[PDB]
Design an enzyme around this catalytic site. Structure first.
Site, PDB file in Angstrom:
ATOM      1  N   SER A 117     -19.081 -48.044 -22.968  1.00  0.00           N
ATOM      2  CA  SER A 117     -17.705 -47.497 -22.974  1.00  0.00           C
ATOM      3  C   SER A 117     -17.643 -46.105 -22.283  1.00  0.00           C
ATOM      4  O   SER A 117     -18.056 -46.035 -21.125  1.00  0.00           O
ATOM      5  CB  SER A 117     -17.173 -47.534 -24.399  1.00  0.00           C
ATOM      6  OG  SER A 117     -15.774 -47.350 -24.384  1.00  0.00           O
ATOM      7  N   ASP A 224     -12.089 -58.241 -24.180  1.00  0.00           N
ATOM      8  CA  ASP A 224     -12.196 -56.833 -24.517  1.00  0.00           C
ATOM      9  C   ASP A 224     -10.818 -56.193 -24.387  1.00  0.00           C
ATOM     10  O   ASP A 224     -10.258 -56.124 -23.294  1.00  0.00           O
ATOM     11  CB  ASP A 224     -13.197 -56.167 -23.550  1.00  0.00           C
ATOM     12  CG  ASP A 224     -13.544 -54.753 -23.951  1.00  0.00           C
ATOM     13  OD1 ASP A 224     -12.704 -54.093 -24.616  1.00  0.00           O
ATOM     14  OD2 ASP A 224     -14.634 -54.300 -23.604  1.00  0.00           O
ATOM     15  N   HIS A 254     -15.365 -55.945 -27.456  1.00  0.00           N
ATOM     16  CA  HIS A 254     -15.862 -54.743 -26.793  1.00  0.00           C
ATOM     17  C   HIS A 254     -17.346 -54.392 -27.036  1.00  0.00           C
ATOM     18  O   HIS A 254     -18.050 -54.052 -26.091  1.00  0.00           O
ATOM     19  CB  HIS A 254     -14.952 -53.590 -27.213  1.00  0.00           C
ATOM     20  CG  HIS A 254     -15.319 -52.253 -26.641  1.00  0.00           C
ATOM     21  ND1 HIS A 254     -15.314 -52.039 -25.270  1.00  0.00           N
ATOM     22  CD2 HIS A 254     -15.528 -51.073 -27.276  1.00  0.00           C
ATOM     23  CE1 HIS A 254     -15.615 -50.758 -25.107  1.00  0.00           C
ATOM     24  NE2 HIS A 254     -15.737 -50.126 -26.281  1.00  0.00           N
TER      25      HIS A 254
END
Length: 280
Positions: A117, A224, A254
């Site tokens: 991320s 996601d 995710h």
């Protein structure tokens, strides 16, 4: 008075480093018994911390890699106001400080980055700042896109001066329960100033892609809701890297390294194969 973590533990009792701004960052190491074949820095995402990577780092250490990490400023056991950064480049600068210290102690070893991320955006910007310096990068659902609606919104809110639904992080309900009860995770809503810095990161990633030549493995879930799969396809197309691979996990959310067991087992296996092939 002794400097302490936000949880009141003295830094003198913990592995740490002091960054360029005089802030203490909490550090973690997973070292093999033998001489390491490579170094790998683990770069965590927004709101989380380095302890979330325990099992992944233990798998990497088992391949004779020396794994190291730190909690980014404003995260986990490191100092700083929670989820605040003077400029996004502080995160990159601090990864490079840690990387340079490890390379001083373990010269001649290849160095890899692994980011998830925001940690993935930090990894991309770190490798772009030093072309040819890193042997490879492993990105798990990296932050590379920003909604144009959220972008103009954050800019207007910044000119004037809500938490994530944990169920979108993973289909693995036990992993969502673990996430919701970890005291080192910040589950608060996004501060305006931090939102502006995430927009700065996305802009900088866009501009870096023509100079990004590091080998990379990109893992992305098709479902996601935080980092849209469209960004993984664009990253594959726009990066100039001669060695780039994408793996899409159909239906996955995710946090791929904390997803349904069949997904997590494959993610661990694919990172093992990719890093093993590039350290042989």
């Amino acid at each position: 008075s002794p400097r302490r973590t936000p949880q009141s533990i003295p830094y003198q009792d913990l592995p740490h480093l002091v960054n360029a701004d005089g802030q203490y960052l909490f550090c973690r190491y997973w070292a093999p018994t033998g001489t390491p074949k490579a170094l790998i820095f683990v770069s965590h995402g927004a709101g989380e911390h380095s302890g979330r990577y325990e099992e992944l780092a233990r798998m990497l250490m088992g391949l004779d890699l020396l794994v190291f990490a730190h909690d980014h400023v404003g995260h986990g056991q490191s100092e700083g106001e929670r989820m605040v950064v003077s400029d996004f480049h502080v995160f990159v600068r601090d990864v490079l400080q840690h990387v340079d210290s490890m390379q001083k102690d373990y010269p001649g070893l290849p160095v890899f980055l692994l980011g998830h991320s925001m940690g993935g955006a930090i990894a991309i910007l770190t490798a772009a700042e030093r072309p040819g310096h890193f042997a490879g990068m492993v990105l798990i659902s990296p932050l590379v896109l920003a909604n144009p609606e959220s972008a103009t919104t954050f800019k207007v809110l910044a000119a004037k001066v809500g938490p994530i639904d944990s169920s979108v992080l993973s289909r693995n309900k036990t992993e969502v329960d673990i996430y919701n009860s970890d005291p080192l995770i910040c589950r608060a809503g996004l501060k305006v100033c931090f939102g502006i810095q995430l927009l700065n990161a996305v802009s900088r990633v866009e501009r870096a892609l023509p100079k990004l030549t590091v080998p990379f493995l990109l893992l992305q879930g098709s479902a996601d809701r935080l980092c849209d799969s469209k960004g993984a396809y664009l990253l594959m197309e726009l990066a100039k890297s001669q060695d780039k691979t994408l793996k899409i996990y159909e239906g996955a959310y995710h946090v791929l390294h904390k997803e349904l067991p069949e997904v997590t087992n494959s993610v661990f296996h694919e990172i093992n194969m990719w890093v093993s092939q590039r350290t042989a």
